[PDB]
């Protein structure tokens, strides 16, 4: 029963430092053979090995992140210790400890891992959104339908609503889930898929409420013309 | 990725699904061991297969692990729901000197049919180019397995800077959707003959493009 906590701020600001605390159970780390790693997952992205330490104080490094990284272990409290330095928002990431079998009559894999903790690095500052159209073209398709839209750019925190005509119009309308972008802002597209025939003759506006920064806009739609 | 694997591999409960992690002189092929992790949406990492084959307690036997040359796989028969989750291999690199992991892939236990994704493109609004700013708009729904990579094109140049794309997410219908971004100056959408938004969904690879010149 060898168990692993992750524990460290949820949030982190760019430049600060992020100190990251694994705490180990049922396993010494002073024993032989008893390795663990920090290994990072930034939102729908594949995992990332970035440090080992061991027993002896030894400790490796991913050569992309060396210069940023520090590893460390806190016998008295059993506990292995992550620092990263310069955060950016392109870092945000889930952050896992894992015991590493470490000795060759074993292997070199990730046997036991943490939970994981998310780091987001951030502002301290919310932010409205900008919206801008995104005009509908009146050209014919198949389906006799065309998809116009709201986008909504660079705003935090989430969340954010967009409806259409105040609300009556619901039929059609595809809100997307929020990208979280590298500057540590979101943005998101609300689409409404409408009948071509109407471009010329049915006003299209997109309501958008940004509660936390107290933001509201209303957008027309207007359809592509030449 | 050092290590390359599938974006999404699915099958129907029952059948029998492999996913290929191809690797080279450097670690693979150098005769580093080869593991696997699961991985369900929400949780951490679970150790599948360590040294190419070997299963921890409680991975059953129609899980299995091999390895050839500069690749290795894993083979699932019999697929049961509880199989769908993201999948990893790992191995080591002695060029980068570290550990390396595959890019992952999404085993889907089909549920439902497949479905293509539907791809709209907008450009750049005459608006957001009159703040000097320029973004362009990817808009994936409606598809199933819930797994797409997406790439953009200036021309027929690949971009890999500016870009932001979701996580597929599910949707009412309980298909997916997803969303992909590419932000520019305006004299570089305004310079290029065309600019693309390049889907693909296992396997299969649809571009839409738009052009400054289109009115």
């Known amino acids: 029963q060898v168990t692993l906590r992750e524990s460290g701020p949820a949030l982190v600001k760019p430049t600060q430092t992020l100190t990251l605390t694994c705490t180990i159970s049922?396993?010494?780390?002073?024993?032989?053979?008893?390795?663990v790693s920090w290994i990072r997952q930034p939102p729908g992205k594949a995992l990332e090995w970035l440090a080992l330490?061991?027993?002896?104080?030894?400790?490796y490094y991913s050569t992309s992140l060396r210069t940023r990284l520090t590893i460390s272990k806190d016998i008295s409290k059993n506990q292995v210790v992550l620092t990263m330095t310069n955060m950016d928002p392109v870092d945000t990431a889930t952050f896992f400890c894992?015991?590493?079998?470490?000795?060759?009559?074993?292997?070199?894999?990730?046997?036991?891992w943490g939970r994981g903790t998310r780091v987001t690095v951030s502002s301290a500052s919310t932010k409205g959104p900008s919206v801008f159209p995104l005009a509908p073209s009146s050209k014919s398709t198949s389906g006799g339908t065309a998809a116009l839209g709201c986008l909504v750019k660079d705003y935090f925190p989430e969340p954010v609503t967009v409806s259409w005509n105040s609300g009556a119009l619901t039929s059609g309308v595809h809100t997307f889930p929020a990208v979280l972008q590298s500057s540590g802002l979101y943005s998101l597209s609300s689409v409404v898929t409408v009948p071509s025939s109407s471009l010329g003759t049915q006003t299209y506006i997109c309501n958008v409420n940004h509660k936390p920064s107290n933001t509201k806009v209303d957008k027309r739609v207007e359809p592509k013309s030449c | 990725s050092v290590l390359t694997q599938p974006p999404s591999v699915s099958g129907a409960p029952g059948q029998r699904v492999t996913i290929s992690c191809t690797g080279s002189?450097?670690?693979?092929?150098?005769?580093?061991?080869v593991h696997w992790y699961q991985q369900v949406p929400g949780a951490a990492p679970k150790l599948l297969i360590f040294?190419?084959?070997n299963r921890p307690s409680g991975v059953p036997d129609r899980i299995s692990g091999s390895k050839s040359g500069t690749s290795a796989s894993l083979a699932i028969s019999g697929l049961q729901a509880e199989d769908e989750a993201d999948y990893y291999c790992?191995?080591?690199?002695?060029?980068?000197?570290?550990?390396?992991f595959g890019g992952g892939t999404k085993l889907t236990v089909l549920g439902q049919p497949k479905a293509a994704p539907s791809v709209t493109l907008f450009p750049p609004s005459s608006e957001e180019l009159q703040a000097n700013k320029a973004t362009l708009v990817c808009l994936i729904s409606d598809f199933y397995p819930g797994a797409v990579t997406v790439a953009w094109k200036a021309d027929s140049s690949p971009v890999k800077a500016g870009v932001e794309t979701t996580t597929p997410s599910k949707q009412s219908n309980n298909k997916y959707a997803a969303s992909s971004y590419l932000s520019l100056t305006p004299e570089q959408w305004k310079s290029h003959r065309s600019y693309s938004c390049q889907v693909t969904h296992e396997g299969s690879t649809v571009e839409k493009t738009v052009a400054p010149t289109e009115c």
């Open positions: 330490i061991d027993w002896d104080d030894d400790k």
């Open positions: 040294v190419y084959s």
């Open positions: 002189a450097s670690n693979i092929g150098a005769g580093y061991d």
């Open positions: 894992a015991r590493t079998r470490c000795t060759s009559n074993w292997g070199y894999y990730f046997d036991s």
């Open positions: 790992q191995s080591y690199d002695d060029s980068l000197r570290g550990w390396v």
């Open positions: 049922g396993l010494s780390l002073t024993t032989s053979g008893v390795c």
